[PDB]
Curated annotation (Swiss-Prot), chain A:
Portion held of the full protein: 3973 to 5037 of 5037
Motif Selectivity filter in this chain: 603-609
Role this protein plays: Cytosolic calcium-activated calcium channel that mediates the release of Ca(2+) from the sarcoplasmic reticulum into the cytosol and thereby plays a key role in triggering muscle contraction following depolarization of T-tubules. Repeated very high-level exercise increases the open probability of the channel and leads to Ca(2+) leaking into the cytoplasm. Can also mediate the release of Ca(2+) from intracellular stores in neurons, and may thereby promote prolonged Ca(2+) signaling in the brain. Required for normal embryonic development of muscle fibers and skeletal muscle.
Residues noted as binding Ca(2+) in the record, renumbered to the chain: T710
Organism: Oryctolagus cuniculus (Rabbit)
Protein name: Ryanodine receptor 1
Amino acids binding ATP: 239-243, 663-668, 688-694
Sites of Phosphotyrosine modification: Y572
Name of the gene this protein is made from: RYR1
General remark: Binding of [3H]ryanodine indicates that the heterozygous channel is activated by Ca(2+) concentrations 4-fold lower than normal. Single-cell analysis of cotransfected cells shows a significantly increased resting cytoplasmic Ca(2+) level and a significantly reduced luminal Ca(2+) level.
Length: 746, 146, 48
């Protein structure tokens, strides 16, 4: 709201702000000891939080050299030596909070059974890092005596932590906004170098997102980044997924539609981080339940090492199995038996049995882990796709599928259970589609189709029927939603990785009959690595053309057989003299089999095993036939196969080079090339790392998912409404806050 | 130095110093670097050859035993596919040096059952092994040059 | 040569207006400018 801000700017508020800040500073500096005013300090922390929220909301987004910015600047200038001691107190308390339990603190240990003393604490603090005279004097004054024995460091460091962190982050955001708004102001500069620790402490927790909306203006909005979210970005899994997404968008994806894919990737990565956070180390019926939950958590935590151990066991079993020998007399016909040739020790069959049982156990462990880990992601993907197809499209409402996609019918036949959005966040999807398609179609038909209950209960409440029956025993008879479980089984069995793992399971189970089927598990794990995936993908990239070329080989060899059947019959003689039943070109099928059997394995055509054409007529016809067969068949077929595979390699390398070059020369989010950001040194490096660092948008979206609308700001509410509407106009697109606003005013 | 010193015993070790200086020139460095540019992929492809030939040996051990006879008549101890290790060695020894698959040295499948199974086995072995392996090696080296 | 020709023709169709001689850089001042330029002003099939 511009009018309210303009009216409030011309008011006698800055003096009140200065008075409040001075009063608060003297509150902390005087009334902090005696350990009897915790409630007062909590109240002042809350009041300071509300005050800085008011200041931030008053500032918001504006012109880079606006009047409100100058007013705020002179308010800070008049507030010199009024917030400095507050910042110093916050910095020293944060230092105390982080130092306790960091280094040599579990190694120093004055009292193994008791606590530290005042002199001991002073000596430790002097021996520590970043401690000054007046600061340690004030800390000793604020340190409670408790007879120099009951100094509980654990209860002292965690005393005022969350409000202090919130105030520090908010004041850091405010100072960063003031620094970024005015380009050059020496007063704010020299006010800033004195207070640098409180700014550097919150350096990696300050986001930056640029929006084009809000009356066609560009402003930077700030937010908080959780520590767990920052620590979850260093896993190679997420980086590999991001690289795969970027490659898919650049190569396979088109234009003017990338941003929906970006939002989908952000949502998927948010769900992945939520699953990873849930699957963590900290995590008689109740004991059994918690033991089962802990076991499943441990199993889902370790999944990639289990596949490696399975591969190792497969190699070990295969190496052990390279000892068989077929014998007639069994030492321990149609009675040939298979036995190990050990010749050194008899501890071979027990080793094989133990390794087989261990391999089976690892196989069951990994299939249970896959069922417990990756299935929710696919379920959430399907639910999100159904929500998108039902809300903004009439695939199951306006029109109908044309009986061509079985997945469409299967996804349609789930709209009958109350527990439909099990994992999708926006539970208000049925209400949303009812409100959207409420006037054009009857409400009763929509409720019947979606399985919604009576609309009388929804429109008018009763506030009198709130039952709560006791659980007792056997509460799982109603917990099954039959239809939802059937749909889940269908979608989990139509998948690919689960089908492959099930094939692995059944092949191992069939191999438990002491056979080579364990040795048949080799390539299926040998192709499940990262660095052979590229080679196998290059081979299978031209999947159809190779099959077509093989069919062309079959057609050409067949036509050659037909044209050589009724002209050349006595030449084919694959035997010696005095043998009448030895022709291999009498039957058409046998002649075709012989021509294929030779022309696929050659290098001398067919003339290396057939009677030489002597002076018995048809000499020139036979030789021109054979030489043209050689040339056409062998040269064309081998050359096309080689050309297809070489072209596959070249196409793969070209795609990789193109995607790397495009990522190196454009901003992806913004449409400006790498030429406009060369006016300043390292301009493009800072442009894609500070303004819109790609990963910053995901952090902002995850922050926006939390912090419900009861506490949203204007910008947050606008962004949430825009995201719910799914129109994607708040993205920077053309301008990137460097032009127009900073083109002239800098 | 140490190879020359060991070669001072009047042997061929002096003649073993040839390639080590033959690859220390400027204009062969580019060709040798192009060959060794895809160092890991060639080793992986060789390992894939070993895996595929091993699986073919396993699937051909318990189905085709009387066909392998690398001798003449009136000779009982001449099977080269009885032992698993010997059969694997024979399949590697043939499938790495071929051009006629394995059918240039093994008894022809006559009308004694398993004729179609044996022929489809042999032709798919030829196609997969030889075509895939040679094509991947050629593709790797051409891609290195490019 | 075949792959190069296909890539070149696709890239040229993706970066020029064919009918007009202006490149795909002048229609970036507004969001989705080039998408609307070849779909509304001269959609090629409109001339037929
Ligand atoms: Zn940009
Ligand atoms: Zn045009």
């Amino acid at each position: 709201c511009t009018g309210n801000q303009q009216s409030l700017a011309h008011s006698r508020l800055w003096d009140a702000v200065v008075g409040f800040l001075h009063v608060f500073a003297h509150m902390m500096m005087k009334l902090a000891q005696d350990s009897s005013q915790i409630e007062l300090l909590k109240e002042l922390l809350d009041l300071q939080k509300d005050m800085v929220v008011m200041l931030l909301s008053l500032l918001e987004g504006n012109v880079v050299n606006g009047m409100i910015a100058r007013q705020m600047v002179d308010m800070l200038v008049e507030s010199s030596s009024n917030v400095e001691m507050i910042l110093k107190f916050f910095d020293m308390f944060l230092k105390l909070k982080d130092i306790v339990g960091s280094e040599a603190f579990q190694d120093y240990v004055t009292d193994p059974r008791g606590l530290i003393s005042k002199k001991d604490f002073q000596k430790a603090m002097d021996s520590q890092k970043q401690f000054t005279g007046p600061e340690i004097q004030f800390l000793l004054s604020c340190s409670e005596a408790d007879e120099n024995e009951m100094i509980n460091f654990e209860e002292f460091a965690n005393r005022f932590q969350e409000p202090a962190r919130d105030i520090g982050f908010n004041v850091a955001v405010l100072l960063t906004n003031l620094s970024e708004h005015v380009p050059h102001d020496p007063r704010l500069r020299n006010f800033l170098e004195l207070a640098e620790s409180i700014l550097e402490y919150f350096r990696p927790y300050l986001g930056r997102i640029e929006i084009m909306g809000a009356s066609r203006r560009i402003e930077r909005i700030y937010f908080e980044i959780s520590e767990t979210n920052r620590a979850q970005w260093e896993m190679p899994q997420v980086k590999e997924s991001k690289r795969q997404f970027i490659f898919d968008v650049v190569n396979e994806g088109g234009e003017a539609e990338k941003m929906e894919l970006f939002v989908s990737f952000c949502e998927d990565t948010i769900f992945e981080m939520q699953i990873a956070a849930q699957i963590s180390e900290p995590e008689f019926w109740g004991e059994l339940e918690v033991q089962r939950v802990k076991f499943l958590n441990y199993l889902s935590r370790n999944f990639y090492t289990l596949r490696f151990l399975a591969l190792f066991l497969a190699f070990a079993i295969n190496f052990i199995l390279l000892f068989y020998k077929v014998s007639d007399s069994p030492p321990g016909d149609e009675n040939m038996v298979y036995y190990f040739l050990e010749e050194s020790t008899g501890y071979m069959e027990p080793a094989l049995w133990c390794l087989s049982l261990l391999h089976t156990l690892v196989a069951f462990l990994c299939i249970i882990g896959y069922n417990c880990l990756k299935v929710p992601l696919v379920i959430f993907k399907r639910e999100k796709e159904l929500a998108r197809k039902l809300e903004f499209d009439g695939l199951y409402i306006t029109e109908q599928p044309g009986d061509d996609d079985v997945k469409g019918q299967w996804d349609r036949l789930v709209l009958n259970t109350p527990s439909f959005p099990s994992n999708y966040w926006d539970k208000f999807v049925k209400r949303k589609v009812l409100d959207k398609h409420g006037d054009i179609f009857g409400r009763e038909r929509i409720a019947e189709l979606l399985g919604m209950d009576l609309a009388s209960l929804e429109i008018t409440a009763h506030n009198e029927r709130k039952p709560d029956p006791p659980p007792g025993l056997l509460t799982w008879l109603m917990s099954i939603d039959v239809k939802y479980q059937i749909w889940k089984f269908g979608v989990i069995f139509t998948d690919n990785s689960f089908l492959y793992l099930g094939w692995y399971m059944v092949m191992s189970l069939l191999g438990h009959y002491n056979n080579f089927f364990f040795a048949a598990h080799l390539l299926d794990i040998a192709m499940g690595v990262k660095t052979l995936r590229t080679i196998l993908s290059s081979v299978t990239h031209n999947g159809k053309q190779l099959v077509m070329t093989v069919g062309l080989l079959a057609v050409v060899v067949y036509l050659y057989t037909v044209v050589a059947f009724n002209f050349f019959r006595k030449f084919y003689n694959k035997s010696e003299d005095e043998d009448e039943p030895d022709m291999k070109c009498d039957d058409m099928m046998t002649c075709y089999l012989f021509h294929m059997y030779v022309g696929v394995r050659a290098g001398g055509g067919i003339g290396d095993e057939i009677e030489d054409p002597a002076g018995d007529e048809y000499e020139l016809y036979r030789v021109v036939f054979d030489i043209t067969f050689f040339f056409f068949v062998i040269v064309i077929l081998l050359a096309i196969i080689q050309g297809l595979i070489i072209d596959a390699f070249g196409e793969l390398r070209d795609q990789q080079e193109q995607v790397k070059e495009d990522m190196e020369t454009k901003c992806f989010i913004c449409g400006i090339g790498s030429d406009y950001f060369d006016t300043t040194p390292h301009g493009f490096e800072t442009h894609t790392l500070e303004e819109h660092n790609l990963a910053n948008y995901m952090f902002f979206l995850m922050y926006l998912i939390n912090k419900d609308e009861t506490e949203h700001t204007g910008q947050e509410s606008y962004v949430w409404k825009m995201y719910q509407e799914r129109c994607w106009d708040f993205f920077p697109a053309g301008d990137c806050f460097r032009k127009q606003y900073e083109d002239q005013l800098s």
